[PDB]
């Protein structure tokens, strides 16, 4: 766990954390998502989605439009820096992405795009 983090989305519509810190010195970064709840993907599905803070509202809105079968994410959305699959209870999914896509002057935000969830399920990711 030098260039990774483990993150859980649960039945209470929260991520375990609201802040991720990525070490400047990292080549790649991995986010390992799991769902320690009991609810299935339709009731309480979570993904881990990374964009700039300005792109977050568009990513969420177009995601909802996109529907459950597409993991509530617009296909091929260039705003998304990193994404997992949408997961339900007992599932897990990781994503690895290049630190270079963390462009030097940006503010970054992570969030779930399952409808409604981003009200609580969001945080900041900072390259440090
Ligand atoms: Cu969620």
Swiss-Prot record:
Subcellular location: Periplasm
PROSITE patterns named among the record's database cross-references: COPPER_BLUE
Cysteines joined through disulfide linkages: 3-26
Residues bound to Cu cation: 46, 112, 117, 121
Listed InterPro entries: Azurin (IPR014068), BlueCu_1 (IPR000923), BlueCu_1_BS (IPR028871), Cu-binding_ET (IPR050845), Cupredoxin (IPR008972)
Keyword terms of this UniProt record: Copper, Disulfide bond, Electron transport, Metal-binding, Periplasm, Signal, Transport
GO function terms (MF aspect): copper ion binding; electron transfer activity; identical protein binding; transition metal ion binding; zinc ion binding
One GO cellular component term: periplasmic space
Residues annotated as domain Plastocyanin-like: 1-128
Lineage: superkingdom: Bacteria
Role of this protein: Transfers electrons from cytochrome c551 to cytochrome oxidase.
NCBIfam families, sorted: azurin (TIGR02695)
PANTHER family named in the record: AURACYANIN-B (PTHR38439), OUTER MEMBRANE PROTEIN H.8 (PTHR38439:SF2)
Name the record gives this protein: Azurin
Organism encoding this protein: Pseudomonas aeruginosa (strain ATCC 15692 / DSM 22644 / CIP 104116 / JCM 14847 / LMG 12228 / 1C / PRS 101 / PAO1)
Gene, per the UniProt record: azu
């Amino acid at each position: 766990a030098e260039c990774s983090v483990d993150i859980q989305g649960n039945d209470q519509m929260q991520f375990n954390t609201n802040a991720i810190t990525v070490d400047k010195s990292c080549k790649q970064f991995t986010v390992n998502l799991s769902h320690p709840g009991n609810l299935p993907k339709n009731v309480m599905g979570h993904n881990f989605v990374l964009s700039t803070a300005a792109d977050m509202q568009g990513v969420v809105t177009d995601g909802m439009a996109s529907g459950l079968d597409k993991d509530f994410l617009k296909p091929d959305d260039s705003r998304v820096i990193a994404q997992t699959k949408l997961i339900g209870s007992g599932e897990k999914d990781s994503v690895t992405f290049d630190v270079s896509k963390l462009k030097e002057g940006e503010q970054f935000m992570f969030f779930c795009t399952f409808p409604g969830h981003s009200a609580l399920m969001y945080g900041h990711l900072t390259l440090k």
